[PDB]
Amino acid sequence: QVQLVQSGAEVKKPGSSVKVSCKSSGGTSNNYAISWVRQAPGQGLDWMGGISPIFGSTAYAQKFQGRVTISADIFSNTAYMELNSLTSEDTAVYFCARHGNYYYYSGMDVWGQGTTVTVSSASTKGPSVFPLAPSSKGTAALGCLVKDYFPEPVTVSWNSGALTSGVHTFPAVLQSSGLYSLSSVVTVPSSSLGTQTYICNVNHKPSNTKVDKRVEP
Amino acid sequence: DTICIGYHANNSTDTVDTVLEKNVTVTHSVNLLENCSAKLRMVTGLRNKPS
Amino acid sequence: SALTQPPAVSGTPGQRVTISCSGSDSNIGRRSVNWYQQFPGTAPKLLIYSNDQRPSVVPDRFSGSKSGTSASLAISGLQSEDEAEYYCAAWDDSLKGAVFGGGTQLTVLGQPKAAPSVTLFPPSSEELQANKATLVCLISDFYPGAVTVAWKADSSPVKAGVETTTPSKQSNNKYAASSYLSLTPEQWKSHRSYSCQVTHEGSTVEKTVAP
Amino acid sequence: IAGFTEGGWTGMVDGWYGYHHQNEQGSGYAADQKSTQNAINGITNKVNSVIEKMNEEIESKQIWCYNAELLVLLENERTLDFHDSNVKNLYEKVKSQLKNNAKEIGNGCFEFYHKCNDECMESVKNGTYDYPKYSEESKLNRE
Ligand SMILES: *[C@@H]1O[C@H](CO)[C@@H](O)[C@H](O)[C@H]1NC(C)=O
Numbered sequence: 029q030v031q032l033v034q035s036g037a038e039v040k041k042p043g044s045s046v047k048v049s050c051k052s053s054g055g056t057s058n059n060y061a062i063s064w065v066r067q068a069p070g071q072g073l074d075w076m077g078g079i080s081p082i083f084g085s086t087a088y089a090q091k092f093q094g095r096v097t098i099s100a101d102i103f104s105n106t107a108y109m110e111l112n113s114l115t116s117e118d119t120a121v122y123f124c125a126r127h128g129n130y131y132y133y134s135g136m137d138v139w140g141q142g143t144t145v146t147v148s149s150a151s152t153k154g155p156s157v158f159p160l161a162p163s164s165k166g167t168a169a170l171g172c173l174v175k176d177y178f179p180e181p182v183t184v185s186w187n188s189g190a191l192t193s194g195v196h197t198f199p200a201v202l203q204s205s206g207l208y209s210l211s212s213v214v215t216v217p218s219s220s221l222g223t224q225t226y227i228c229n230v231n232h233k234p235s236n237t238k239v240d241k242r243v244e245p
Numbered sequence: 246d247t248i249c250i251g252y253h254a255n256n257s258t259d260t261v262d263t264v265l266e267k268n269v270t271v272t273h274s275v276n277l278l279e280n281c282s283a284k285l286r287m288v289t290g291l292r293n294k295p296s
Numbered sequence: 297s298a299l300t301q302p303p304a305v306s307g308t309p310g311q312r313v314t315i316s317c318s319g320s321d322s323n324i325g326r327r328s329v330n331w332y333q334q335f336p337g338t339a340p341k342l343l344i345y346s347n348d349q350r351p352s353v354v355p356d357r358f359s360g361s362k363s364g365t366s367a368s369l370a371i372s373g374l375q376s377e378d379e380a381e382y383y384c385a386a387w388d389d390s391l392k393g394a395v396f397g398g399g400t401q402l403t404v405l406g407q408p409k410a411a412p413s414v415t416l417f418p419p420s421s422e423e424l425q426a427n428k429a430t431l432v433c434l435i436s437d438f439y440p441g442a443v444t445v446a447w448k449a450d451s452s453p454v455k456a457g458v459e460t461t462t463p464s465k466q467s468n469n470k471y472a473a474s475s476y477l478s479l480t481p482e483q484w485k486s487h488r489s490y491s492c493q494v495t496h497e498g499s500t501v502e503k504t505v506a507p
Numbered sequence: 508i509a510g511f512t513e514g515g516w517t518g519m520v521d522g523w524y525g526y527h528h529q530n531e532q533g534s535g536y537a538a539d540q541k542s543t544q545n546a547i548n549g550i551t552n553k554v555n556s557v558i559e560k561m562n563e564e565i566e567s568k569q570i571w572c573y574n575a576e577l578l579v580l581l582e583n584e585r586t587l588d589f590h591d592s593n594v595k596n597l598y599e600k601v602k603s604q605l606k607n608n609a610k611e612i613g614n615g616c617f618e619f620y621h622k623c624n625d626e627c628m629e630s631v632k633n634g635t636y637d638y639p640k641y642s643e644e645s646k647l648n649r650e
Contacts, residue, residue: 059544059551063394070462072297073332073340073383075394082551083523083543084257084273084290089393103279103558123339129540130547131521132394133387135330135345142339158420160432164503169415173423173432196436196466198474201459210461211474213434246623248609248631249527249616250598252590254515263583271587272523275554280561282576287557288583289550291523291590294514 030055032124032140039146039179039234045112048143050124052105058082061127063136064098064109068120076122079107083130111145119147146179150206153178154235157228159243160213162221170221170243171213172228176203182232184212189229221245254295261286270294298323299384301397309406312372317384317397319365324386329367331360332383340383344369371402379404405440409497410470412438416492416503419484429479431505433492434472441471446493449483510615511594523590524597528628537632542597549589553582604636608645620645 033051040046050062063078077088081100088096097110111118123142128134155177162170174182184197191214200210212228227242259274262284272290300318307313319325331344344350344360347367359370367384384397417432435443441463447454457478463471475492484490484507491504510527519525522538523546557578598615609619621644623631630636 056551056555058554059547065394072399073385073396075396077393082289082547082554087392090391091393101279102275102554125340128345129544131538131540133328133540135342135349137342137345137351139339139341156423156426156428158423158426158430160417160420163418164415169434169436171417171432171434173420173430175423175428175430194467196464196472198472199461199464201461201476203459203478209430209459209476211432211434211476213436213474215436246530246619246621247528247612247616248601248619248623248628249510249529250594250601251509251511251516251519251525251527251615252594253519253523253525254517255520256517261583262580263587264580265584269587277558277575277579281572285575285579286583287554287579288586289554292515292587295517296508296514 030057030126030138032057032126032138034122034124034140034143037144037146039148040114041151042115042147042149044114045110046114046145047108047110048122048124048145050107050109050140052107052126056105057107057126057138058102058105059130061085061129061131061134062100062107063125063127063132064107065123065125066120067123067142068117071120074120076109076111078132080130081107085131087132114147116147116149118145120145144180148179148206150178152235153207154237155182155209155230155232155239157230157239157241159241160211161243162245166218167215168218168221169213169215170226170245171211172230172241172243174200174210174212174230176205176207176209177232177235177237178207179234180208182208182210182230184231185229186212186214187227187229191226252291254293256295257290257293259286259290261288263288297398298388298391298395299386299397301382301384301400303398304401304403306403306405307374309374309376309404311374312370313374313402314371315369315382315384315400315402317367317369319367319386321365322390323365323388323395324362324367325365326389327387329360329362330385331369332385334381334383336381343382374404376404376406378402403440407439407469410437410439411499412436412443412494412496412501414492414494414501414503416505418505418507419479419481424481424484427481429481429484431477431479431490431492433475433477433494433503435474435494436472437466437468437470438472438496439470440497441465441473442496443473444495445473445475446495447475447477448489448491448493450487450489451491509612511598512614524594526601526628526632528623530623530625530628532625539597539632542593546590546593550586553586557582600634601631604631604634604638606638606642607649608638608641620648 031053035049061080064076079100124140125136126138156175160171195214197212200208260268270293277285328346332340334340347362382400412435419429460475519536523543525538621641
């Protein structure tokens with residue numbers, strides 16, 4: 029079975045360029061057409077262009093023309109997408125897909141995991157965490173606020189990951205200020221509050237920040 | 246009403262040599278110098294003969 | 297978008313529902329149609345290709361049709377797992393590119409209405425010390441997963457600093473969401489009350505905090 | 508305008524082998540998806556195979572350099588002839604479909620003795636052409 033393997037997620041300041049890779053693992057895709065399709069966050073699919081290495085084709089969307097360089101390598105079963113003159117608007121998730129045949133008319137039936145690329149003029153920052161005390165509620169809610177961190181993503185666990193039931197961590201919110209922020213909450217029995225203690229494990233790899241915080245009433 | 250059967254052509258300038266012919270122009274070719282003879286062009290496309 | 301898709305469709309389990317694609321002659325009119333299925337945060341999957349062809353693995357309840365410059369995707373006997381975003385696609389002869397629809401949101405609502413439980417949090421003592429204030433609104437256990445959040449200062453509505461996350465599903469299948477109002481400490485100290493107004497299916501729930 | 512005997516089609520970008528049709532509805536280039544893909548499946552297979560064989564000393568490495576360059580020549584030969592074989596199969600794939608419902612103009616083109624609309628054209632291309640459907644129409648026009 030054929031598989032598509034993309035480089036990990038990338039983050040760049042505007043105007044630089046980023047090159048994303050696609051490896052055909054477990055077989056070759058040289059005999060297939062491959063396309064790069066991008067999804068802006070919460071947006072529809074957008075065709076950037078494609079390449080068919082044996083056929084001898086390199087194709088471009090009219091809109092991405094002159095700014096993108098799509099190249100391929102038959103020996104390594106790898107396809108490349110290079111985007112240039114990056115802007116914040118180029119922030120998206122980028123996919124590679126293998127078609128049914130050599131050309132782009134056929135449906136695309138094999139997809140890479142996708143590589144997320146984010147363009148922001150800011151740099152790396154550690155999150156600021158603040159506890160959310162249980163004032164309100166036979167069941168109650170307490171939580172953690174993760175504030176002002178760049179770039180994505182941050183992981184949160186509770187009590188060294190031992191606490192799992194009823195825990196929900198929200199999607200992060202990108203601040204007008206340009207910093208991501210998010211909240212984590214858990215629902216617990218009201219009875220257990222005075223007795224049982226709660227600590228949140230927050231890890232942010234990009235800053236390489238590891239913070240433990242205890243939430244108290 | 247007519248229908249024609251035809252083959253592909255383009256402006257590819259790539260040339261390769263074959264046993265019988267030398268410098269045949271083709272639509273696409275791959276260069277094997279990734280892994281010397283200076284030219285190790287292998288044809289993938291077909292012979293380029295524009296209208 | 298070269299291809300026209302409805303923003304959202306809805307169905308109850310067991311129903312047959314249809315999704316439309318409106319194009320011009322340059323694309324659908326002259327080209328084959330492909331349909332894609334996407335689950336959130338994951339890569340798309342190919343559903344229909346060449347207008348009506350279906351992959352071997354895809355359930356037979358999926359079918360495709362194309363007429364003129366418009367195409368339709370039909371899913372009969374709708375199931376809960378089919379809830380996802382759907383994209384029509386075609387090659388465009390004028391553009392010499394693949395074009396996509398805006399995307400179509402299918403909702404399979406197999407739960408009875410659940411109004412949200414709202415719990416609103418005041419700024420932490422630490423955060424104020426930082427000279428920052430944020431208010432956190434937690435909306436939980438509501439179904440279906442669409443709500444509107446409004447923030448009030450005193451009894452008057454405010455919009456600066458309001459940033460709201462999109463609904464996400466629970467373990468118990470209900471949706472949950474969070475909203476934040478970012479404040480300067482003086483703004484927070486000054487007005488007597490702040491309220492968070494959540495509206496779900498036409499009914500408003502409110503929580504209020506005071507310094 | 509012809510046609511593969513006289514030369515290649517610059518108008519066709521979407522295939523190695525294809526059709527060109529002209530009728531009341533229009534004139535246009537189309538690719539034969541089947542035969543080209545087969546070829547690509549074929550061309551790529553040999554290419555992968557050629558690479559696999561590849562991996563006093565100055566002197567021997569010159570020997571080895573020889574070994575490749577010969578192989579390229581064989582496969583380049585085998586390759587171009589493969590296409591030339593394939594284009595033939597397509598013309599004839601078509602000539603076997605049409606029979607006397609059409610004229611072989613020579614140089615690689617066919618002119619129909621019956622009216623051919625886009626739907627009939629397509630029937631020709633996919634191998635489902637209905638000879639009897641137009642065969643009465645064709646018999647008359649010849650005379
Ligand atoms: C090969 O062809 C080119 C024209 O593309 C010509 O300039 C060159 O001299 C030829 N070389 C040989 C060795 O025939």
